[PDB]
Amino acid sequence: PQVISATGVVKGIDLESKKITIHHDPIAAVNWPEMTMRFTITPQTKMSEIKTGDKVAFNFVQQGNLSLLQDIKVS
Numbered sequence: 001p002q003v004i005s006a007t008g009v010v011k012g013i014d015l016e017s018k019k020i021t022i023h024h025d026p027i028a029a030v031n032w033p034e035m036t037m038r039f040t041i042t043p044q045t046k047m048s049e050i051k052t053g054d055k056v057a058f059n060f061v062q063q064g065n066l067s068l069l070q071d072i073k074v075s
């Protein structure tokens, strides 16, 4: 779209199911308060090495009921 930047903390990562759970700060761009959400990852998501408990900066777009990561790095 409509790429949306957020920050948060990694709560869980699963490269098998292709999900990363992030506790993120509010996102006024889409009227989300503080929440823990599953973000979808693809072979195309630009990744740095991130671990559970890491503080992260990330970009994502929305399409379907999926929130799809375009990249993610450690903050």
Ligand SMILES: [Ag+]
Pocket: 024, 032, 035, 036, 037
């Ligand atoms: Ag959310």
